Nucleic acid binder design. Structure first.
Ligand SMILES: [Mg+2]
Ligand SMILES: [Mg+2]
Ligand SMILES: [Mg+2]
Ligand SMILES: [Mg+2]
Ligand SMILES: [Mg+2]
Ligand SMILES: [Mg+2]
Ligand SMILES: [Mg+2]
Ligand SMILES: [Mg+2]
Ligand SMILES: [Mg+2]
Ligand SMILES: [Mg+2]
Ligand SMILES: [Mg+2]
Ligand SMILES: [Mg+2]
Ligand SMILES: [Mg+2]
Ligand SMILES: [Mg+2]
Ligand SMILES: [Mg+2]
Ligand SMILES: [Mg+2]
Ligand SMILES: [Mg+2]
Ligand SMILES: [Mg+2]
Ligand SMILES: [Mg+2]
Ligand SMILES: [Mg+2]
Ligand SMILES: [Mg+2]
Ligand SMILES: [Mg+2]
Ligand SMILES: [Mg+2]
Ligand SMILES: [Mg+2]
Ligand SMILES: [Mg+2]
Ligand SMILES: [Mg+2]
Ligand SMILES: [Mg+2]
Ligand SMILES: [Mg+2]
Ligand SMILES: [Mg+2]
Ligand SMILES: [Mg+2]
Ligand SMILES: [Mg+2]
Ligand SMILES: [Mg+2]
Ligand SMILES: [Mg+2]
Ligand SMILES: [Mg+2]
Ligand SMILES: [Mg+2]
Ligand SMILES: [Mg+2]
Ligand SMILES: [Mg+2]
Ligand SMILES: [Mg+2]
Ligand SMILES: [Mg+2]
Ligand SMILES: [Mg+2]
Ligand SMILES: [Mg+2]
Ligand SMILES: [Mg+2]
Ligand SMILES: [Mg+2]
Ligand SMILES: [Mg+2]
Ligand SMILES: [Mg+2]
Ligand SMILES: [Mg+2]
Ligand SMILES: [Mg+2]
Ligand SMILES: [Mg+2]
Ligand SMILES: [Mg+2]
Ligand SMILES: [Mg+2]
Ligand SMILES: [Mg+2]
Ligand SMILES: [Mg+2]
Ligand SMILES: [Mg+2]
Ligand SMILES: [Mg+2]
Ligand SMILES: [Mg+2]
Ligand SMILES: [Mg+2]
Ligand SMILES: [Mg+2]
Ligand SMILES: [Mg+2]
Ligand SMILES: [Mg+2]
Ligand SMILES: [Mg+2]
Ligand SMILES: [Mg+2]
Ligand SMILES: [Mg+2]
Ligand SMILES: [Mg+2]
Ligand SMILES: [Mg+2]
Ligand SMILES: [Mg+2]
Ligand SMILES: [Mg+2]
Ligand SMILES: [Mg+2]
Ligand SMILES: [Mg+2]
Ligand SMILES: [Mg+2]
Ligand SMILES: [Mg+2]
Ligand SMILES: [Mg+2]
Ligand SMILES: [Mg+2]
Ligand SMILES: [Mg+2]
Ligand SMILES: [Mg+2]
Ligand SMILES: [Mg+2]
Ligand SMILES: [Mg+2]
Ligand SMILES: [Mg+2]
Ligand SMILES: [Mg+2]
Ligand SMILES: [Mg+2]
Ligand SMILES: [Mg+2]
Ligand SMILES: [Mg+2]
Ligand SMILES: [Mg+2]
Ligand SMILES: [Mg+2]
Ligand SMILES: [Mg+2]
Ligand SMILES: [Mg+2]
Lengths: 114, 119, 209, 56, 123
RNA sequence: AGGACCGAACCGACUAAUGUUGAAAAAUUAGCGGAUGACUUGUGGCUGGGGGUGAAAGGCCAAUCAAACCGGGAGAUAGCU
RNA sequence: ACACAGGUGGUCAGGUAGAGAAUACCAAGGCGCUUGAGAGAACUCGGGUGAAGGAACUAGGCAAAAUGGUGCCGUAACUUC
RNA sequence: AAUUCCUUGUCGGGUAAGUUCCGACCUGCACGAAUGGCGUAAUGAUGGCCAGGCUGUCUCCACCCGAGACUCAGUGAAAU
RNA sequence: CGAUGUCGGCUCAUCACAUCCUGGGGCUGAAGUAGGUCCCAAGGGUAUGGCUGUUCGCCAUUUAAAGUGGUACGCGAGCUGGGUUUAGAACGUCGUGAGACAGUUCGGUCCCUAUCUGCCGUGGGCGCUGGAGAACUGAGGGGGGCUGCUCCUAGUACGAGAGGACCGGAGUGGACGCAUCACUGGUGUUCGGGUUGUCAUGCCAAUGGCACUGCCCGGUAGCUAAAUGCGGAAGAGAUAAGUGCUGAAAGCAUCUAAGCACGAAACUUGCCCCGAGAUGAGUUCUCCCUGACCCUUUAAGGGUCCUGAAGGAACGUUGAAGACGACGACGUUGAUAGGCCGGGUGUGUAAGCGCAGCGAUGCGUUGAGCUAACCGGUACUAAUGAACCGUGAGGCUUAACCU
């Protein structure tokens, strides 16, 4: 409705950069440990993007310490602070769920130049 | 339960409904008035009227789309040469339902569905 | 304390500064205007009768339109009634805004739930299904046994059986109110209230505190 | 799954108490041809709300 | 989201490779166990010379789930497998000395301050 | 070469579900076994009831079998209902 | 007993793919199975997909799911070789 | 033990836990040598047990597609 | 005995209290903690596995606890068919034998479309005394009632130490329940794409049909749980066991006889829902009707003509309402549904053309094209002028007022 959209567009963030699935992205989130807010980095491959305006989200997969870690960030949440596209990739799907069984050389994605 | 859903099942499976409305939309373009049952007449508006709106822009691509929906070149020719420019100013609502009583074989509530600019 | 009559606009979320997402339910609350003040001398109890929204003039009936004309107020889409506490009073044509909830902290939201229709005992009363294999003859989601043998030639009252589920008055208690926006007539409560989108809601301050 | 006593014709009449048909309330009359039809249906000659909606 | 009969990988150098949850502790009829939850387990596969032995029965704390754990913004952190760190039965401190793979911020407490200390990465 | 192997026709009937006033007085559906042999099938023949026939289950002998069917003794007899 | 999802011997054997008379789609040819129309509850029937777990179900992995082809590599105990 | 009453014998293995299973023991209620004894490769829509894969079997069900059920019109049973 | 289906499991249960947990007490050979024992208390709660057909039992590991019983050893016109208990076969054993064995072993058809009671839902009729539209009160009925752990009080009381509280407060769980779809997900045979075989559209190109939606990949709305909100209370009243105060009978003593006080998850309330068919049919508010005459058996009488209100119903467009009724929205003075326009979302760069390449193909046009149920708009189509039902001041008897 008009009432919902007015409440949601005033909470959105005006600086979300344009990224596609397959872009190697680097997300800086806020971490409150003890009492000092620090800014932990998270960097992997965008395997899914779900666009719903304020409720928009995206999924980042990385291979951390041998283990694969998926993390579904809420885009307009303030606990994420920066989103930076490190390396943009060339895929032909909207959601890269097949990377959950590809490792090493098989899970490469080529670079979307230009 | 059927909350906020759309489309009538009409006691058919999905491929039969698509092939029945493919035949029936071509039959309505061909004769400009047909007599069918009232649930099938109301559900036919969601098929024919997107085809007529498709026919307002005569491109080669839209001929291929309208052929992919109907699979009859005589209907696609009638859509873009006649019913395209006939309805070129109307903002939708290209057809009209006229309830015509009850079928003698099974008491089915029938209806005439016709194009607006017919008579 | 009295409550107010609103409408379920939908659900959204309020991102706090701390990184917490609060799932909220937007309830628009237009100006509730009173239509009748009830008292002990005439009615035996103390309450007010409010109205909200608008209604088509050709559709409000002459008995109903005469009731608004006595109070001298525009016809609203319904008539609800809130019991008065002691030391609490209102005039007849008085309008009541959403600023009444400016300093409450928890509310109870009463609505009519969604209509599930005729529901079976797996869905309605959370019965266990029987075995889906191992020989079961036509009895996968049936309620099973319903009584005992000859001792009570009879099934007891209130036995959990299939029937109408939902489409009835339910009240969710102690909802945390998040934001009271008087300028655009809104009310944000934490969590999910009953009812579909666009249905009437009765928001009262919480009685269990 | 079957009865133990013959139900009476009185009980039979009480079950058929709701099986009565409802006659049509009033037939609408066309303003041009003046003939009677079902409300919101076309006439037998092919009129509906005045105009001749279908030839014959 | 670990229940009975669930096989888990082992996240430390305690000597086990593959353990099975046999009881989700802390409450009657308790179905599941997320991260930070104590489970009684058995050992199904071990290294030849470890602190633990095949068939031992002991406790464990779940540190990684494939279902994942949710953060108060609404975000969720999923892993590709199920991993737990073995505990002593009584003292309920970890047996191994080196934690493998990441853990989460839900794990840290006064109870498991040692495990997040030894983890290579805390998400 | 094969009472060989895998597998359709064909022959059989292991399991489940349906069906159980059925579509069907034993079937359908999805699987299943054999499938050049002690195989299977058409047509015609022969064996008759204390008899036949039986790779034997008291199986089969016209939807009937610890003695078929039909007619007769016959209105058997019934201290039983 | 039925205009009955059964049973019934012989002959004819197109295309594409395929080892094939399997199977998919078609030709020649023949059909749409003699109640329909709506609606889109529980429940039943026949199916589809499923988070996390993976036999904890159960008398029993019943049923489902899974495996599935060709070529090449490679292949244990035991053995009447 | 297709045989063992006592018996879930005892011991060992397998399992977190095994009245079943497997290996022993012999105290064979009441094995035993062509109403055959003991072995035995291959074979079995055979019996019991274990493991891998697999999964709505299950924790605990959810949704969907169709055929009924439901409503209308036509025909129109049955047991009791 | 002209048939009352049986062990165990499954799925629903329900009651008792001789109480397993939680609650309240008394005594203790009760320091504390933890117990023993008995009294009160049935409000709620009250495991999962291994083995076995098992109930049971043993064992593993839980838990505050894993209560004992009644219910045709509850429950097969609800399910299962492992056990028992048909016909086959075998062992041991008995018998010359046919055969037999609460000895064992392998195999072995579980039917019923609900007339009545009952129960879960949902309607029609009529009533409630003129008719109608609403809002109610609450007689009564139902729901709900569980609890861990940590922290503080406080290492305080207690204790030789070891240990370690009552009372009170805060947090966070398990199980259960209600609601919801904002999140995370599932589904999504009505959206998009990939692709195998084949057939067709004259052919190319491009599509469509069929093959389980052909096989997949994603996915809108909706519905959903595993997702996330919320709930159990506090309080009050009267109490149980119990504890008392004052106090005689009985100069004392004594909780009781007179009088008074305290006392539990039980009881009545408080919370939620239904609820005036509550025939004892209630209350409030508003709206509508202010015509003539005939009749004989003169009465709560019958009829004629005129009149047809408020409202309702029917019909139509329909719905996050729904089996059907019902309920809700709307019917031109109109956004009810469809279409249309715009947006969003999803899918992932359409077709055509051009270029590069021997070609498969790649690139540009191009985040293109298509896009369901969604959002905001828009009378384009369909929601008709009517007709129909409902009437025309509403009994008697007193009483109090009014003139
Ligand atoms: Mg709709
Ligand atoms: Mg039909
Ligand atoms: Mg198809
Ligand atoms: Mg509904
Ligand atoms: Mg079950
Ligand atoms: Mg059966
Ligand atoms: Mg079934
Ligand atoms: Mg019974
Ligand atoms: Mg009785
Ligand atoms: Mg009788
Ligand atoms: Mg009837
Ligand atoms: Mg052979
Ligand atoms: Mg045979
Ligand atoms: Mg078959
Ligand atoms: Mg073969
Ligand atoms: Mg015999
Ligand atoms: Mg015979
Ligand atoms: Mg004879
Ligand atoms: Mg004889
Ligand atoms: Mg004689
Ligand atoms: Mg005689
Ligand atoms: Mg026929
Ligand atoms: Mg051929
Ligand atoms: Mg074939
Ligand atoms: Mg037929
Ligand atoms: Mg259905
Ligand atoms: Mg499947
Ligand atoms: Mg699954
Ligand atoms: Mg998926
Ligand atoms: Mg999975
Ligand atoms: Mg088991
Ligand atoms: Mg079990
Ligand atoms: Mg099987
Ligand atoms: Mg299969
Ligand atoms: Mg013996
Ligand atoms: Mg024995
Ligand atoms: Mg096992
Ligand atoms: Mg042993
Ligand atoms: Mg077993
Ligand atoms: Mg042995
Ligand atoms: Mg012998
Ligand atoms: Mg001998
Ligand atoms: Mg022998
Ligand atoms: Mg009928
Ligand atoms: Mg008897
Ligand atoms: Mg009898
Ligand atoms: Mg007692
Ligand atoms: Mg005590
Ligand atoms: Mg009780
Ligand atoms: Mg109880
Ligand atoms: Mg009670
Ligand atoms: Mg109480
Ligand atoms: Mg047990
Ligand atoms: Mg007894
Ligand atoms: Mg019994
Ligand atoms: Mg019992
Ligand atoms: Mg039984
Ligand atoms: Mg049996
Ligand atoms: Mg025998
Ligand atoms: Mg016997
Ligand atoms: Mg009624
Ligand atoms: Mg009560
Ligand atoms: Mg409590
Ligand atoms: Mg949702
Ligand atoms: Mg949504
Ligand atoms: Mg999804
Ligand atoms: Mg799908
Ligand atoms: Mg969804
Ligand atoms: Mg094709
Ligand atoms: Mg081509
Ligand atoms: Mg075809
Ligand atoms: Mg075909
Ligand atoms: Mg209290
Ligand atoms: Mg005294
Ligand atoms: Mg005294
Ligand atoms: Mg008191
Ligand atoms: Mg307008
Ligand atoms: Mg519209
Ligand atoms: Mg659009
Ligand atoms: Mg997009
Ligand atoms: Mg292009
Ligand atoms: Mg395409
Ligand atoms: Mg580009
Ligand atoms: Mg796009
Ligand atoms: Mg709209």
């Amino acid at each position: 409705s008009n009432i919902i959209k007015q409440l949601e567009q005033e909470q959105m963030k005006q600086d979300v950069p344009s990224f596609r699935p397959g872009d190697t992205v680097e997300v800086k989130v806020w971490v409150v440990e003890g009492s000092k807010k620090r800014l932990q980095a998270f960097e992997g491959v965008v395997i899914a993007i779900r666009n719903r305006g304020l409720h928009s989200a995206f999924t980042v997969r990385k291979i951390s310490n041998g283990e694969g870690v998926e993390r579904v960030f809420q885009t307009h949440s303030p606990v994420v602070d920066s989103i930076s596209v490190k390396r943009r990739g060339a895929v032909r799907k909207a959601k890269l769920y097949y990377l959950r069984e590809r490792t090493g050389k098989a899970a490469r994605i080529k670079e979307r130049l230009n | 339960m059927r909350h906020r859903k759309s489309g009538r099942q009409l006691n058919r499976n999905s491929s039969h409904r698509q092939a029945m409305f493919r035949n029936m939309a071509g039959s309505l373009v061909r004769h400009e008035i047909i007599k069918t049952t009232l649930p099938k007449a109301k559900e036919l508006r969601r098929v024919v009227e997107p085809l007529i709106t498709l026919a307002k822009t005569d491109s080669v691509a839209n001929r291929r789309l309208a052929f992919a929906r109907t699979r009859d070149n005589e209907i696609v020719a009638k859509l873009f040469n006649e019913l395209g420019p006939r309805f070129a100013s109307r903002a939708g609502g290209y057809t009209r339902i006229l309830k015509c009583g009850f079928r003698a074989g099974d008491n089915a509530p029938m209806a005439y569905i016709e194009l607006v600019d017919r008579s | 304390m009295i409550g107010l009559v609103g409408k379920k606009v939908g659900m959204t979320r309020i991102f706090t500064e701390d990184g917490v997402s609060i799932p909220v339910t937007v309830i628009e609350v237009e100006a509730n205007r009173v239509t009748q003040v009830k008292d002990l001398a005439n009615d035996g109890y103390r309450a007010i009768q409010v109205t909200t929204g608008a209604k088509k003039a050709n559709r409000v009936t002459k008995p109903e339109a005469g009731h608004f004309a006595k109070a001298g107020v525009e016809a609203g889409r319904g008539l609800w009634e809130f019991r008065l506490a002691e030391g609490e009073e209102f005039t007849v044509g008085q309008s009541i805004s959403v600023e009444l909830f400016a300093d409450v902290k928890k509310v109870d939201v009463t609505g009519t739930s969604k209509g599930k229709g005729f529901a079976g005992t797996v869905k309605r009363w959370n019965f266990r299904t029987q075995d889906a294999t191992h020989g079961n003859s036509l009895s996968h989601r049936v309620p099973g046994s319903i009584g005992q043998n000859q001792t009570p030639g009879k099934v007891f009252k209130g036995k959990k059986m299939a029937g109408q589920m939902g489409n009835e008055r339910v009240t969710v208690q102690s909802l945390d109110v998040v934001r009271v926006d008087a300028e655009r007539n809104l009310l944000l409560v934490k969590g999910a209230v009953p009812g579909a989108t666009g249905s009437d809601l009765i928001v009262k301050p919480a009685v269990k505190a | 799954a079957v009865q133990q006593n013959k139900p009476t014709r009185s009980k039979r009449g009480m079950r058929r108490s709701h099986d009565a048909l409802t006659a049509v309330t009033s037939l609408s009359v066309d303003k041009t041809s003046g003939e009677k039809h079902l409300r919101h249906h076309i006439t037998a000659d092919g009129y509906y709300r005045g105009r001749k909606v279908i030839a014959k | 989201m670990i229940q009975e009969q669930t096989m888990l990988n082992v996240a430390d150098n305690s000597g086990a490779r593959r353990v099975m949850c046999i009881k989700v502790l802390g409450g009657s009829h308790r179905r599941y166990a997320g991260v930070g939850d104590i489970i009684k387990i058995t050992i199904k596969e071990a290294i030849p010379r470890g602190k633990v032995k095949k068939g031992d029965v002991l406790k464990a704390v779940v540190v990684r789930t494939k279902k994942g754990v949710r953060r108060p913004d609404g975000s969720v952190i999923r892993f590709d497998g199920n991993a737990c760190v073995l505990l002593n039965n009584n003292s309920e401190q970890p047996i191994g000395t080196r934690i493998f793979g990441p853990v989460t911020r839900e794990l840290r407490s006064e109870k498991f301050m040692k495990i997040i200390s030894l983890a290579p990465e805390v998400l």
